[PDB]
Design a protein around this ligand. Structure first.
Ligand SMILES: CC(C)N(CCCNC(=O)Nc1ccc(C(C)(C)C)cc1)C[C@H]1O[C@@H](n2ccc3c(N)ncnc32)[C@H](O)[C@@H]1O
Ligand SMILES: [K+]
Ligand SMILES: [K+]
Length: 550
DNA sequence: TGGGACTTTTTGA
DNA sequence: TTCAAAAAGTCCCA
């Protein structure tokens, strides 16, 4: 399956990571460094390590010959020494190890067979017999849906310090690498960036912060590093050195449309205008890692201090309907099959794209709220001609197999009363803040999140005021500071972060609310000349900036 | 083949 | 009993 050009780490990144770890190695003082890659594959990293080592030994061959055994340190012996004592690799694929072993053997190209330290094993189960000086590589990423159940139980029992709930497989590789790193060693890996902000990575970030000194983080944000692969990458470099001060070099990319396979070295790219550099004090990291420059930190801290309320304080949040099979329960509003379904069971259905700022597009789909169907004898045509077409798939849902749900019921139908009221809705993934007031009792899947204001905060906050500030440029920038960057121009808008947004009340409340009412009034007209909306938004942003003192 | 529009349901807790 | 998180996303066209 995984036999193609994908998953090959680009040469620029491989070269950077190998150099970053061995740039300043004192081969005279320690001529026996152990370099490990625990997901070496065909040896993208290890073959480069061999070359870097060979130059390093050959450049100091006469100093080694003089300080140590004169007969042992010769140029002809460098190849044997590297393979015996220096390069280590591990991979679960037997064929990959077979190829890597031949590649290392053919580096020199008789005598006694040289023992190459390659292991065909599960790196997370191996009883590692010693720690390592340097660890580099590109671990596998496997999410919570794509992991096997038996294997996941093992991770939960043994890697509980970093792996729980919706965590990822590469969380465990981070723990393994840190655990088998020598005092004073250096590790450098490329992994997905999502653990820097995700709720799942909370324990993993705590593990890294409390056990290694993070030297450098390269955040590519939504840039496409791996061709034809939908993943966002970062490079972490960490050590176990005794140092008094622990500051992190953060290199965050500025333009996501760059092509990495166009510059000579990654170092040239990082020092250029295509990246920004700033320092974060590792002691000042909380459970959240707020990796922003001084301007954005000052901006963020001003808003946090000024706002006395959060959305969670004043709102009730909930995820959308999860049918478990959308094609079985969602039909076009013009589908002739809806004449078989009583309007009592029909609900309006919108997708994330139907959410704009301040207002929702008119629904084009309907949801059959099948939970309200009492008996199978009644409304049999609905069960036999609409929902039953997917009966086999519906029966394969978890709650149907355990008997909690009937085969025709919605898997997670939530509570209708939550949806059939005035509320605010936003897409779960978007390029910008899009918070709308729903007036039409719209239902939606889990690609749209909703909340409504608690009764006790209705006098302080109105729906019109909230969509005003939340759709403002100030709050767009404020949310994206700590949001979870998913892919190019996509952020996660999930309650675990959206409900942490903080809000304020001051003298500008009335004028902000009135401007929001004007914007809503314009956006709902048939002859909508939606140009004045931009001007009103600009005026509102000025009031908000005045309110927060920025 | 790479870029852009859009986003299901499986899953642990 | 029933919540909400999770992109080695998914899909299509020029
Ligand atoms: C494929 C991705 C996921 N890979 C990224 C690193 C480069 N991998 C790579 O070049 N693989 C490869 C390339 C070509 C071949 C062919 C010979 C052409 C068939 C075979 C394998 C991760 C490697 O980790 C290995 N892996 C996965 C789980 C896991 C674990 N639990 N313990 C230890 N090693 C683990 C897996 O076999 C991969 O080689
Ligand atoms: K000597
Ligand atoms: K990406």
């Amino acid at each position: 399956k995984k036999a193609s050009g994908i998953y090959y780490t680009p040469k620029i990144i491989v070269d950077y990571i190998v150099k970053k770890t061995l740039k300043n190695h004192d081969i005279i003082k320690n001529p026996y460094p152990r370099i490990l890659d625990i997901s070496c594959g065909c040896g993208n990293f290890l073959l480069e390590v061999y070359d870097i080592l060979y130059d390093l030994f050959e450049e100091n061959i006469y100093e080694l010959k003089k300080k140590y055994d004169e007969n042992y340190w010769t140029v002809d012996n460098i190849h044997r020494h590297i393979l015996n004592y220096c390069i280590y690799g591990a991979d679960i694929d037997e064929k990959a190890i077979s190829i890597l072993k031949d590649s290392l053997t053919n580096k020199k190209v008789d005598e006694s067979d040289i023992k190459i330290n390659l292991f065909c094993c599960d790196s997370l189960k191996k009883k590692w017999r010693y720690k390592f000086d340097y660890i580099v590589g590109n671990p596998p990423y496997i999410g919570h849906k794509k992991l096997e159940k038996k294997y996941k139980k093992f991770l939960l029992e043994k890697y509980s310090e970093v792996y729980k709930d919706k965590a990822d497989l590469y969380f465990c590789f981070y723990k393994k690498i840190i655990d088998i790193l020598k005092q004073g060693g250096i590790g450098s890996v490329i992994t997905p960036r999502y653990f820097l902000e995700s709720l799942s990575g909370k324990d993993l970030r705590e593990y890294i912060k409390s056990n290694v000194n993070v030297q450098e983080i390269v955040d590519f944000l939504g840039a496409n590093i791996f061709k034809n692969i939908g993943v966002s990458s970062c490079i972490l470099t960490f050590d176990k050195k005794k140092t008094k001060e622990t500051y992190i070099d953060v290199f965050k990319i500025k333009n996501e449309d760059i092509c990495i396979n166009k510059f000579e070295t990654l170092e040239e790219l990082l020092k250029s205008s295509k990246f920004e550099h700033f320092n974060i004090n590792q002691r000042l990291l909380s459970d959240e890692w707020i990796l922003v420059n001084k301007d954005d930190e000052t901006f963020y801290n001003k808003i946090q201090e000024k706002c006395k309320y959060s959305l969670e304080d004043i709102a009730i949040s909930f995820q959308g309907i999860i049918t478990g099979c959308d094609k079985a329960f969602i039909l076009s509003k013009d589908d002739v099959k809806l004449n078989l379904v009583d309007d009592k069971f029909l609900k309006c259905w919108i997708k994330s794209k139907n959410i704009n700022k301040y207002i929702v597009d008119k629904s084009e789909y309907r949801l059959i709220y099948s939970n309200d169907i009492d008996n199978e004898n009644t409304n049999k045509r609905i069960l036999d001609e609409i929902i039953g077409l997917y009966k086999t798939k519906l029966e394969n849902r978890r709650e149907c197999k355990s008997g909690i749900r009937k085969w025709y019921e919605l898997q997670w139908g939530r509570e209708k009363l939550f949806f059939e009221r005035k509320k605010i809705m936003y897409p779960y993934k978007s390029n910008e803040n899009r918070f709308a007031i729903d007036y039409d009792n719209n239902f939606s899947s889990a690609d749209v999140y909703s909340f409504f204001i608690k009764e006790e905060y209705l006098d302080k906050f109105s729906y019109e005021y909230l969509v005003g500030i939340l759709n403002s440029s100030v709050y767009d920038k404020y949310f994206k500071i700590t949001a979870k960057k998913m892919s190019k121009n996509i952020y996660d808008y999930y309650p675990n972060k959206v409900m942490k947004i903080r809000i304020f009340r001051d003298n500008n409340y009335e004028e902000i609310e009135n401007l929001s009412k004007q914007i809503i009034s314009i956006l709902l007209n048939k002859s909508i000349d939606k140009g004045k909306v931009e001007k009103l938004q600009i005026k509102m942003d000025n009031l908000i900036m005045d309110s927060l003192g920025i």
